[PDB]
Amino acid sequence: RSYAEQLIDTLEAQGVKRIYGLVGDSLNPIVDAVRQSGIEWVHVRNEEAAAFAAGAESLITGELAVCAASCGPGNTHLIQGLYDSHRNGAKVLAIASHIPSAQIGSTFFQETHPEILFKECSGYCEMVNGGEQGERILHHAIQSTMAGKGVSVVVIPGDIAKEDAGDGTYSNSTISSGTPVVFPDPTEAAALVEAINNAKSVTLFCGAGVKNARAQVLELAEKIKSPIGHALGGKQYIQHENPFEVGMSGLLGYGACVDASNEADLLILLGTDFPYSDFLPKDNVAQVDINGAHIGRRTTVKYPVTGDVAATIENILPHVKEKTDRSFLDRMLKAHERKLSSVVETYTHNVEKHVPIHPEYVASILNELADKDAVFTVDTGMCNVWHARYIENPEGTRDFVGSFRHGTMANALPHAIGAQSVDRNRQVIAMCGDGGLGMLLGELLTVKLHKLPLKAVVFNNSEVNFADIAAAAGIKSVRITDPTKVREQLADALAYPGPVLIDIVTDPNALSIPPTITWEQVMGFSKAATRTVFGGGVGAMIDLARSNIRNIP
Amino acid sequence: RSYAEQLIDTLEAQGVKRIYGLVGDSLNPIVDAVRQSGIEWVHVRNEEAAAFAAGAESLITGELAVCAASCGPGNTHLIQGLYDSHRNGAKVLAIASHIPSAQIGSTFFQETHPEILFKECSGYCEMVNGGEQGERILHHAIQSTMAGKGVSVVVIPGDIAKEDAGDGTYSNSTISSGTPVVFPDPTEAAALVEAINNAKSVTLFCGAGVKNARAQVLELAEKIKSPIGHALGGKQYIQHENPFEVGMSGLLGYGACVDASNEADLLILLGTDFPYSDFLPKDNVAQVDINGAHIGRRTTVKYPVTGDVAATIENILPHVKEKTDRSFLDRMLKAHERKLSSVVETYTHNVEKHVPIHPEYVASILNELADKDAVFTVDTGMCNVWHARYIENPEGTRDFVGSFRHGTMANALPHAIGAQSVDRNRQVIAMCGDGGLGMLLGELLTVKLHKLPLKAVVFNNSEVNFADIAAAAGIKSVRITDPTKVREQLADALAYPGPVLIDIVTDPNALSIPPTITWEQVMGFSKAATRTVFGGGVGAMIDLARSNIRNIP
Amino acid sequence: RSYAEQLIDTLEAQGVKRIYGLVGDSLNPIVDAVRQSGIEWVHVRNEEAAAFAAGAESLITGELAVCAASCGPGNTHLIQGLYDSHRNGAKVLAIASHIPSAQIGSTFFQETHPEILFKECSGYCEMVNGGEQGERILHHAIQSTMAGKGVSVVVIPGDIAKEDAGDGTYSNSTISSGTPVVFPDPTEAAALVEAINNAKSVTLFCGAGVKNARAQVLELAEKIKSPIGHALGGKQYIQHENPFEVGMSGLLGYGACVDASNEADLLILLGTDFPYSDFLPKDNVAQVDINGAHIGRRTTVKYPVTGDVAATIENILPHVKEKTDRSFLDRMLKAHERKLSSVVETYTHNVEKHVPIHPEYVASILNELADKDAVFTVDTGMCNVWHARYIENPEGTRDFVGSFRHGTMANALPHAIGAQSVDRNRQVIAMCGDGGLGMLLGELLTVKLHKLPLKAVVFNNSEVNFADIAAAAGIKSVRITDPTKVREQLADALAYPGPVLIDIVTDPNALSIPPTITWEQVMGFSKAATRTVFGGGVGAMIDLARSNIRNIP
Ligand SMILES: Cc1cc2nc3c(=O)[nH]c(=O)nc-3n(C[C@H](O)[C@H](O)[C@H](O)COP(=O)(O)OP(=O)(O)OC[C@H]3O[C@@H](n4cnc5c(N)ncnc54)[C@H](O)[C@@H]3O)c2cc1C
Ligand SMILES: Cc1cc2nc3c(=O)[nH]c(=O)nc-3n(C[C@H](O)[C@H](O)[C@H](O)COP(=O)(O)OP(=O)(O)OC[C@H]3O[C@@H](n4cnc5c(N)ncnc54)[C@H](O)[C@@H]3O)c2cc1C
Ligand SMILES: Cc1cc2nc3c(=O)[nH]c(=O)nc-3n(C[C@H](O)[C@H](O)[C@H](O)COP(=O)(O)OP(=O)(O)OC[C@H]3O[C@@H](n4cnc5c(N)ncnc54)[C@H](O)[C@@H]3O)c2cc1C
């Protein structure tokens, strides 16, 4: 058998179910092996979508996901989605098909040196030079991404896919995909205990690193009476049913999070790399991170701790003294609810009758009507504001995929294609901005071909009729222009048993920016301390804020 | 004044009229300086289009063209178009806006290291670290691309655009954009004279390097009675009104070019880097190239000559003896016309009544109806076959832009946006494949915004209604399904004074591939000598073939 | 036969006589093929020396020179010498032996990715992946460096050297190594003519680009009565027998060059990339360079010309008007001789009796005693000052090799090993600094092994006895401590028919630095205009200065 056959057999034995990619001639031997296997080829019409779809699938499943591209220009289109996947921590293998080995170094038709292009967006990237070495580096690529070291790329000269397979020595191996339990160094954990016991008031600020530490964070918060704020990456895990909830920091922020973080005697950063330093205090900060290289990237950290959040809290809890004074927690919960109530009153008074349709009204209804376990994908831009302030996660059963770190546009539909491919019976909603729809046609043609029943909600601030474009491409569509019809039309679109594009004509003057917000602040290089956020209201998060006030002892 | 103001003033003083790009927040100071200048910002809705549009503009004008992108993901979208522009020899400066200098090295939001990504697709790529150094490297970037050394990239941390301008020392300089006259080394030129005088029969094979050498190539051919064949890059310059015409080599080839090249006593490669070595002889070859590093890249070369084609022929002509025997030239001209007549008879007999519409019928009519000075842009894929075999260049007044070397898909509309922006009164036709239309929407929205009257001819082998999609995006469209209506409907679409999308439903089974053509041959790594080309007919080129037979003495 | 045999046969057929390198196990197949060939392996004891020796050989012969290194750490030692060779324009091929192809991508023992390390110090660098492709990229590497495009590197996985040779298609080719004749663009040449005719006074400032243009530069100078100054790279070609000589600019400078350059109505930079902009005027400058990308790198250039210096002067001379007024030339020649006489009087009055020995006294005697056709190699540091101010080139028959652009230390003995290997009957003098002798032992052991009769002149400012070290390593040595014995002892050492190390105890307080020279000026980032040079005298150059005054009409 050939190396193309061995590559596909190896992926199949490891549980890979799909490969995303646009087929080109250099991939033909690999596509032929996939056709004879149990793996499904997912044909993306835009080559740039393949790596976002694989990234989104891996984020949903926790398992390896795979994308592929043809030689030269083909694998150049992997770069954006691989930066996004790599920064998001998605476990992706990219099969970068390459020119024939005989043409390397001759400035051949389509020739590139793909190893140079993926150096920053991967943990492992090597070229195959034969079947035996190709089997070996395929193992190393999978083992590197499954051990959490980043995206992996295997560059395969087209002709070598047809050469003989290796002998099986590396494909026979079991991949380590376990989660080690990382306890902190006792000296660092003792310094954190002392910092907490010496502080009269503590605030916890959580990011994506608290994903598997909800119970420990909440147990710690109840013991020391600490308000809990979050970065955007931690919103989905820690905001829901949180008795200590004080919102989010940054320009898309809300509530008393910036106040609680800067007024507490001690701030504890838990599993976060929140980059907007002008919102963070410097006086007295602790930071717990599983990657020690991340500690102190964003502000002065006096109590650094390398370790897992859950294992670190479990280790310090018997030595942390109970704080009976919750004056600070009560003050912050009250200020939090007043801040949310104030932005609702200032910006969304009688928003249900606003014409053209207010996007915040759409987001509020969308939060109510979407399924309790829906996946939301979020296009970079204004949709990040609507997700942050209106899309909630009751009981933690929704999933959220976006380009929160790499910040690239037009990611929602490619992410949704991967997320929807995991389970066709699960609802997937893609929040799309009209500006991020220049590549819409290829995304719709992929959705139509694979019958992926995702719901593309377009915040149309153009005038372009996206409902007519979707209908011409063979996709069911609806156009919403009257605010009194949003609930009815959205409920009917979300109930459609198939792919739908929902074209909602929204008000282009929605983004409210206070006169004090500068270009330096927007760009993230303003030094002066700030508590200023973009204008606009908030949604259903106010219900938890209000129950937390009623439950104050 | 600021460095952003100085950058725009410098480009404006050098004759730059447009900057192509998608505006993002990191570019705001530069966009503000453009607004107050005589330069027009051309807003591309797909960021990937900017570098193709600049590349196409530079190929048409011969002058500097400029594209720009916002930080991180933004300048990652420049890569495809910059590889294409760099390989095509287009003189492009890319303004790669970058994250704030204070965040470099902190894994900030959107952070990339753009210097690593452009190393292979540029001749110069440096980062600005202040206003004074920024003025200097802007000069060096422009001087490098104007001297023919490749694409140039200037990476500008967003905050530095607002810092003070340099003192003018480098912006005050005159750029050398001249064309030196490169005569060959007399020893190399003497060896070429001897090779020609010792050969009884000679064939010339021309590429893009004969652009300014038509008269010299034809004068040499008449003196030694040599058939003249071409690579695809040389078709536009040497095929028209050529009394020695014997067609093109490679799988998209036609006529007796492969026979004449391999049967002549001496083959002279003139200004070509044709990469399909299995079509080239090895026994006795000369090669003239202005870049000595390119000589002998593709086959055995015994008579290498570094120099300009026109200056080299002028230098050797007084020493080359007149060949009175034209038996070989006559045999090749006769075989050439029989080969063209044979493929017309085999593949396009009664093609005017073929249903669904034959793409070769569309291409033939398009060649007749398009203006004598039209620009054609060619989408990579089947449109390369139709351009090569049907779109002619009478009197050399048409221009052709495609991704002939980098071979990336979806280039036709981005190339056409740049070409059309040069002169709105000049016809621009974009030959689009239905597979290369996943990014169509953003291209149409740019064309609509700037009122660019290009004609997008879509070879629709899908069923998708692209005419309805174009009409929904606010673009005039027509749908052609009946072959007897192609001439009338195409003539009316080409006459429309504005942008039009022409959706032509064509036969998806057009590509004829002989059973002997292997995947190795398609991929370009088959070693065995070949004369086999893809099936299909040829167009109006047969008229010149037939006049050349009538003019045989 | 094997690819190792084919590589050596190919180099041998192209006239390669030596390969410099330290043999390691990964090179064994290549070393075995060299042993059975006419090529000599030159064993360098310090692997870092190999690339400097090849660079020096190529500078002396004008032909390809070759170095080799073993895998991993071995080819890492090529980098310094390859930056030096690449910047000096030496035509070098480096054979970078690499780990076995089966281990690539496995973090094997000694594994590196050598392609990344040579990107800036080469014009071509590719990896061999088989015998056929290896033959092809060997051709491309040689053709790139012989066409003047920079150093070339061929990376060869150790095991592939034992695989079968390619079929000969590329090794059968003739390499283009000719010198094209580059005439300027007539528009640029016309602007240069106008600038010269409108100026009342002109100064020419020449660099290494005037190597083959002495007669044209001197003919132009006589016609327009222009003083001729030089950068250090042009000293060896234009200073000797020059009736217009006005010295050198920069901190190591001398004479009226800075004055003549800044006081003339027009400055013409001819074949120079002199980097110390604070010594250059900005008001009215022309620049002629064969590489257009270099034009205007260093100051404002209003009259840029891309072209060869000799061809450009030949083209403009019939249109340049004769200037009969030589008031400026006479004033500059007089000021030049007064400046040289003044530094001799200020710094070297009675230097023949100075104790410890003055290095300027050593340099003056060395200039007199060395052969008329000697090669001088110059260690970076104080030896650059002594070469610049004391080592002359009567009739142009001496050669000079140094690290003038890359500026790396300890280059003199590795450069001298390559230069001496070209012709054992030609005198080679290496000017060594005591600080640049930490790697002396390996250099002496190579010189002893190959019986290279070079003369290592050590300016010993330590106390270390280098004569005793050389004697212990088996090399003839002499120690000079008395200034009255320098002439006699140096004459006897230079006459020794074999390698000699001459240990001269010199005064460590020789470097005179005026109180106005700042660290910014030493580092090359001071903006203010300057005419200040380091203290110290000059040598035999004063004889030409004085004859030029006597010959003033
Ligand atoms: C248009 C736009 C606007 C934005 N505006 C904002 C804004 O106003 N506010 C905002 O908050 N964000 C904003 N973001 C996103 C922002 O740039 C950051 O990506 C985000 O704040 C980071 O969230 P995080 O810290 O949860 O995740 P990450 O940056 O991924 O950090 C997670 C950290 O947890 C660590 N970790 C992982 N697992 C564990 C574990 N088991 N134990 C311990 N540590 C662990 C990781 O090593 C890492 O350091 C914006 C994004 C976009 C696209
Ligand atoms: C789908 C597809 C299929 C293709 N199939 C074919 C095919 O079958 N046949 C085919 O021919 N092409 C084919 N091509 C294109 C092919 O890959 C090459 O790009 C093309 O053949 C190169 O043309 P060229 O030699 O004219 O241009 P280039 O490769 O650009 O070479 C031009 C040469 O001229 C030299 N030069 C420039 N100016 C001068 C001067 N003044 N004097 C001297 N030398 C000078 C340059 O240094 C260079 O070496 C295909 C492309 C695509 C997208
Ligand atoms: C310790 C130290 C101190 C130094 N101090 C000084 C100092 O004070 N003064 C000084 O002058 N140097 C000094 N140097 C060297 C300095 O850094 C430069 O390397 C040197 O001045 C450059 O000389 P150049 O212009 O002749 O050569 P290059 O920089 O090599 O420039 C040659 C130019 O000629 C062009 N060219 C080549 N062939 C042709 C042709 N046929 N026609 C046209 N153009 C052609 C090339 O493209 C190039 O642009 C120092 C070096 C060291 C190690």
Side-chain angles (χ1 to χ4, degrees), chain A residues 207-209 232-234 249-252 271-274 276 289-290 294 308-309 384 404-405:
Chain A
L232 181 58
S249 287
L251 287 174
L252 271 48
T272 183
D273 193 28
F274 175 89
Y276 312 108
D289 205 283
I290 201 160
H294 296 193
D308 171 68
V309 173
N384 292 116
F404 303 126
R405 301 149 178 96

mmCIF file of all heavy atoms in Angstrom, chain A residues 207-209 232-234 249-252 271-274 276 289-290 294 308-309 384 404-405, ligand 1:
data_model
loop_
_atom_site.group_PDB
_atom_site.id
_atom_site.type_symbol
_atom_site.label_atom_id
_atom_site.label_comp_id
_atom_site.label_asym_id
_atom_site.label_seq_id
_atom_site.Cartn_x
_atom_site.Cartn_y
_atom_site.Cartn_z
ATOM 1 N N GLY A 207 -10.689 33.562 33.003
ATOM 2 C CA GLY A 207 -10.709 33.398 31.556
ATOM 3 C C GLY A 207 -11.004 31.957 31.178
ATOM 4 O O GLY A 207 -11.429 31.150 32.023
ATOM 5 N N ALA A 208 -10.698 31.592 29.936
ATOM 6 C CA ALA A 208 -10.965 30.259 29.398
ATOM 7 C C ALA A 208 -10.306 29.122 30.197
ATOM 8 O O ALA A 208 -10.793 27.994 30.126
ATOM 9 C CB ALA A 208 -10.528 30.169 27.941
ATOM 10 N N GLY A 209 -9.264 29.430 30.959
ATOM 11 C CA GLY A 209 -8.586 28.434 31.782
ATOM 12 C C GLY A 209 -9.427 27.903 32.939
ATOM 13 O O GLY A 209 -9.001 26.944 33.599
ATOM 14 N N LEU A 232 -13.587 37.740 27.976
ATOM 15 C CA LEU A 232 -14.512 37.187 26.991
ATOM 16 C C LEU A 232 -14.343 35.663 26.826
ATOM 17 O O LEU A 232 -15.347 34.959 26.668
ATOM 18 C CB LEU A 232 -14.332 37.912 25.653
ATOM 19 C CG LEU A 232 -15.209 37.498 24.492
ATOM 20 C CD1 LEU A 232 -16.724 37.644 24.850
ATOM 21 C CD2 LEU A 232 -14.901 38.378 23.256
ATOM 22 N N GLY A 233 -13.095 35.156 26.881
ATOM 23 C CA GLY A 233 -12.876 33.723 26.755
ATOM 24 C C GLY A 233 -13.425 32.899 27.907
ATOM 25 O O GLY A 233 -13.582 31.679 27.780
ATOM 26 N N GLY A 234 -13.673 33.529 29.049
ATOM 27 C CA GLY A 234 -14.195 32.826 30.209
ATOM 28 C C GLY A 234 -15.702 33.002 30.415
ATOM 29 O O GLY A 234 -16.311 32.237 31.161
ATOM 30 N N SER A 249 -14.533 42.972 31.618
ATOM 31 C CA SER A 249 -13.722 44.170 31.392
ATOM 32 C C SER A 249 -13.447 44.354 29.876
ATOM 33 O O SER A 249 -13.819 43.494 29.054
ATOM 34 C CB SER A 249 -12.402 44.091 32.176
ATOM 35 O OG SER A 249 -12.663 44.286 33.554
ATOM 36 N N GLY A 250 -12.817 45.477 29.515
ATOM 37 C CA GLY A 250 -12.500 45.788 28.123
ATOM 38 C C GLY A 250 -13.563 46.671 27.492
ATOM 39 O O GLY A 250 -14.601 46.939 28.117
ATOM 40 N N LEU A 251 -13.331 47.154 26.262
ATOM 41 C CA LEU A 251 -14.291 48.066 25.606
ATOM 42 C C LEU A 251 -15.676 47.415 25.373
ATOM 43 O O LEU A 251 -16.693 48.119 25.357
ATOM 44 C CB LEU A 251 -13.733 48.587 24.275
ATOM 45 C CG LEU A 251 -12.593 49.640 24.410
ATOM 46 C CD1 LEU A 251 -12.009 49.997 23.031
ATOM 47 C CD2 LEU A 251 -13.116 50.925 25.065
ATOM 48 N N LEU A 252 -15.727 46.092 25.204
ATOM 49 C CA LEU A 252 -17.034 45.401 25.031
ATOM 50 C C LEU A 252 -17.677 44.990 26.378
ATOM 51 O O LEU A 252 -18.749 44.367 26.385
ATOM 52 C CB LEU A 252 -16.839 44.136 24.180
ATOM 53 C CG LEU A 252 -16.948 44.283 22.667
ATOM 54 C CD1 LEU A 252 -16.118 45.458 22.124
ATOM 55 C CD2 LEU A 252 -16.570 42.973 21.965
ATOM 56 N N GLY A 271 -6.586 31.649 35.006
ATOM 57 C CA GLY A 271 -6.700 31.090 33.660
ATOM 58 C C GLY A 271 -7.113 32.126 32.623
ATOM 59 O O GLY A 271 -8.064 31.911 31.867
ATOM 60 N N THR A 272 -6.417 33.267 32.615
ATOM 61 C CA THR A 272 -6.741 34.330 31.651
ATOM 62 C C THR A 272 -5.474 34.990 31.137
ATOM 63 O O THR A 272 -4.459 35.052 31.846
ATOM 64 C CB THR A 272 -7.673 35.394 32.278
ATOM 65 O OG1 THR A 272 -7.996 36.362 31.271
ATOM 66 C CG2 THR A 272 -7.046 36.097 33.503
ATOM 67 N N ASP A 273 -5.537 35.428 29.879
ATOM 68 C CA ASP A 273 -4.468 36.197 29.231
ATOM 69 C C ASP A 273 -5.081 37.488 28.604
ATOM 70 O O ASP A 273 -4.582 37.995 27.595
ATOM 71 C CB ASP A 273 -3.724 35.344 28.195
ATOM 72 C CG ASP A 273 -2.430 35.960 27.702
ATOM 73 O OD1 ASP A 273 -1.802 36.742 28.470
ATOM 74 O OD2 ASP A 273 -2.072 35.717 26.529
ATOM 75 N N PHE A 274 -6.167 38.033 29.247
ATOM 76 C CA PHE A 274 -6.871 39.273 28.878
ATOM 77 C C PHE A 274 -5.867 40.371 28.522
ATOM 78 O O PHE A 274 -5.024 40.717 29.347
ATOM 79 C CB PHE A 274 -7.703 39.694 30.084
ATOM 80 C CG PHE A 274 -8.412 41.009 29.930
ATOM 81 C CD1 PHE A 274 -9.682 41.067 29.375
ATOM 82 C CD2 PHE A 274 -7.859 42.171 30.436
ATOM 83 C CE1 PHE A 274 -10.380 42.281 29.323
ATOM 84 C CE2 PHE A 274 -8.549 43.371 30.376
ATOM 85 C CZ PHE A 274 -9.807 43.420 29.828
ATOM 86 N N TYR A 276 -5.968 43.735 27.526
ATOM 87 C CA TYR A 276 -6.192 45.185 27.646
ATOM 88 C C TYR A 276 -5.719 45.676 29.014
ATOM 89 O O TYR A 276 -6.512 45.914 29.924
ATOM 90 C CB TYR A 276 -7.668 45.524 27.368
ATOM 91 C CG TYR A 276 -8.135 44.843 26.092
ATOM 92 C CD1 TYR A 276 -9.014 43.767 26.139
ATOM 93 C CD2 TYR A 276 -7.549 45.144 24.866
ATOM 94 C CE1 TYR A 276 -9.430 43.120 24.978
ATOM 95 C CE2 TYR A 276 -7.915 44.457 23.700
ATOM 96 C CZ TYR A 276 -8.847 43.441 23.767
ATOM 97 O OH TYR A 276 -9.238 42.784 22.617
ATOM 98 N N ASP A 289 -1.717 30.224 36.081
ATOM 99 C CA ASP A 289 -1.803 29.812 34.675
ATOM 100 C C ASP A 289 -1.071 28.474 34.491
ATOM 101 O O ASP A 289 -0.029 28.252 35.126
ATOM 102 C CB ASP A 289 -1.193 30.880 33.747
ATOM 103 C CG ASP A 289 -1.764 30.829 32.351
ATOM 104 O OD1 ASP A 289 -1.353 29.914 31.561
ATOM 105 O OD2 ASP A 289 -2.632 31.684 32.034
ATOM 106 N N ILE A 290 -1.618 27.585 33.672
ATOM 107 C CA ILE A 290 -1.000 26.285 33.442
ATOM 108 C C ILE A 290 0.296 26.416 32.575
ATOM 109 O O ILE A 290 1.184 25.551 32.635
ATOM 110 C CB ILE A 290 -2.015 25.309 32.819
ATOM 111 C CG1 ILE A 290 -1.575 23.844 33.053
ATOM 112 C CG2 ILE A 290 -2.277 25.648 31.358
ATOM 113 C CD1 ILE A 290 -2.680 22.854 32.909
ATOM 114 N N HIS A 294 3.060 32.439 30.227
ATOM 115 C CA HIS A 294 1.990 33.437 30.115
ATOM 116 C C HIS A 294 1.876 34.350 31.329
ATOM 117 O O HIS A 294 1.186 35.378 31.261
ATOM 118 C CB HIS A 294 0.632 32.715 29.910
ATOM 119 C CG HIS A 294 0.546 31.928 28.633
ATOM 120 N ND1 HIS A 294 -0.679 31.445 28.176
ATOM 121 C CD2 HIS A 294 1.513 31.592 27.737
ATOM 122 C CE1 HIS A 294 -0.410 30.797 27.056
ATOM 123 N NE2 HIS A 294 0.906 30.843 26.759
ATOM 124 N N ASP A 308 -2.618 24.147 37.215
ATOM 125 C CA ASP A 308 -4.014 24.053 36.776
ATOM 126 C C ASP A 308 -4.909 24.847 37.750
ATOM 127 O O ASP A 308 -4.669 24.770 38.946
ATOM 128 C CB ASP A 308 -4.395 22.573 36.797
ATOM 129 C CG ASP A 308 -5.867 22.331 36.577
ATOM 130 O OD1 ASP A 308 -6.345 22.591 35.455
ATOM 131 O OD2 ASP A 308 -6.549 21.917 37.543
ATOM 132 N N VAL A 309 -5.939 25.568 37.273
ATOM 133 C CA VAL A 309 -6.802 26.320 38.210
ATOM 134 C C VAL A 309 -7.475 25.407 39.258
ATOM 135 O O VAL A 309 -7.430 25.730 40.454
ATOM 136 C CB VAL A 309 -7.863 27.182 37.492
ATOM 137 C CG1 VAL A 309 -8.852 27.807 38.510
ATOM 138 C CG2 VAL A 309 -7.180 28.273 36.673
ATOM 139 N N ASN A 384 -19.320 40.566 17.857
ATOM 140 C CA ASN A 384 -18.659 40.298 19.142
ATOM 141 C C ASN A 384 -19.329 41.075 20.276
ATOM 142 O O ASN A 384 -19.418 40.555 21.390
ATOM 143 C CB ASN A 384 -17.175 40.641 19.113
ATOM 144 C CG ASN A 384 -16.383 39.725 18.215
ATOM 145 O OD1 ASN A 384 -15.831 40.190 17.245
ATOM 146 N ND2 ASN A 384 -16.294 38.447 18.539
ATOM 147 N N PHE A 404 -11.700 35.080 18.686
ATOM 148 C CA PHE A 404 -11.551 36.010 19.801
ATOM 149 C C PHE A 404 -10.118 36.494 20.004
ATOM 150 O O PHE A 404 -9.908 37.544 20.618
ATOM 151 C CB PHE A 404 -12.062 35.356 21.099
ATOM 152 C CG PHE A 404 -13.505 34.886 20.991
ATOM 153 C CD1 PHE A 404 -13.850 33.569 21.281
ATOM 154 C CD2 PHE A 404 -14.497 35.737 20.541
ATOM 155 C CE1 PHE A 404 -15.172 33.136 21.172
ATOM 156 C CE2 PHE A 404 -15.823 35.303 20.448
ATOM 157 C CZ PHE A 404 -16.154 34.010 20.768
ATOM 158 N N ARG A 405 -9.118 35.738 19.490
ATOM 159 C CA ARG A 405 -7.730 36.105 19.762
ATOM 160 C C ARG A 405 -7.017 36.569 18.517
ATOM 161 O O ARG A 405 -6.271 37.542 18.562
ATOM 162 C CB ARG A 405 -7.010 34.877 20.387
ATOM 163 C CG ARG A 405 -7.681 34.406 21.676
ATOM 164 C CD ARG A 405 -7.563 32.902 21.907
ATOM 165 N NE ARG A 405 -8.181 32.490 23.174
ATOM 166 C CZ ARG A 405 -9.416 32.009 23.295
ATOM 167 N NH1 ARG A 405 -10.184 31.840 22.218
ATOM 168 N NH2 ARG A 405 -9.896 31.689 24.494
HETATM 169 C C1 LIG D 1 -13.661 42.659 18.162
HETATM 170 C C2 LIG D 1 -13.122 42.051 19.434
HETATM 171 C C3 LIG D 1 -13.159 42.793 20.612
HETATM 172 C C4 LIG D 1 -12.723 42.249 21.823
HETATM 173 N N1 LIG D 1 -12.939 42.971 23.008
HETATM 174 C C5 LIG D 1 -12.720 42.370 24.145
HETATM 175 C C6 LIG D 1 -13.148 43.032 25.367
HETATM 176 O O1 LIG D 1 -13.566 44.177 25.440
HETATM 177 N N2 LIG D 1 -13.008 42.271 26.510
HETATM 178 C C7 LIG D 1 -12.514 40.984 26.569
HETATM 179 O O2 LIG D 1 -12.502 40.394 27.643
HETATM 180 N N3 LIG D 1 -12.091 40.375 25.434
HETATM 181 C C8 LIG D 1 -12.194 41.034 24.278
HETATM 182 N N4 LIG D 1 -11.901 40.367 23.101
HETATM 183 C C9 LIG D 1 -11.097 39.141 23.188
HETATM 184 C C10 LIG D 1 -9.698 39.418 23.752
HETATM 185 O O3 LIG D 1 -8.871 39.944 22.713
HETATM 186 C C11 LIG D 1 -9.087 38.124 24.305
HETATM 187 O O4 LIG D 1 -9.021 37.124 23.290
HETATM 188 C C12 LIG D 1 -9.811 37.531 25.520
HETATM 189 O O5 LIG D 1 -10.113 38.553 26.475
HETATM 190 C C13 LIG D 1 -8.988 36.435 26.158
HETATM 191 O O6 LIG D 1 -9.875 35.624 26.946
HETATM 192 P P1 LIG D 1 -9.275 34.584 27.987
HETATM 193 O O7 LIG D 1 -8.268 35.248 28.834
HETATM 194 O O8 LIG D 1 -10.400 33.828 28.599
HETATM 195 O O9 LIG D 1 -8.541 33.522 27.035
HETATM 196 P P2 LIG D 1 -7.019 33.255 26.605
HETATM 197 O O10 LIG D 1 -6.396 34.516 26.166
HETATM 198 O O11 LIG D 1 -7.031 32.069 25.722
HETATM 199 O O12 LIG D 1 -6.317 32.874 27.988
HETATM 200 C C14 LIG D 1 -6.595 31.615 28.625
HETATM 201 C C15 LIG D 1 -5.480 31.370 29.607
HETATM 202 O O13 LIG D 1 -5.831 30.236 30.430
HETATM 203 C C16 LIG D 1 -4.686 29.408 30.545
HETATM 204 N N5 LIG D 1 -5.128 28.051 30.859
HETATM 205 C C17 LIG D 1 -5.737 27.141 30.034
HETATM 206 N N6 LIG D 1 -6.163 26.062 30.649
HETATM 207 C C18 LIG D 1 -5.803 26.278 31.972
HETATM 208 C C19 LIG D 1 -5.960 25.500 33.138
HETATM 209 N N7 LIG D 1 -6.494 24.280 33.143
HETATM 210 N N8 LIG D 1 -5.480 26.000 34.296
HETATM 211 C C20 LIG D 1 -4.882 27.193 34.284
HETATM 212 N N9 LIG D 1 -4.677 28.019 33.247
HETATM 213 C C21 LIG D 1 -5.162 27.496 32.114
HETATM 214 C C22 LIG D 1 -3.954 29.555 29.210
HETATM 215 O O14 LIG D 1 -2.587 29.153 29.301
HETATM 216 C C23 LIG D 1 -4.127 31.051 28.946
HETATM 217 O O15 LIG D 1 -3.062 31.856 29.460
HETATM 218 C C24 LIG D 1 -12.216 40.939 21.842
HETATM 219 C C25 LIG D 1 -12.166 40.195 20.661
HETATM 220 C C26 LIG D 1 -12.616 40.730 19.459
HETATM 221 C C27 LIG D 1 -12.604 39.872 18.217
#
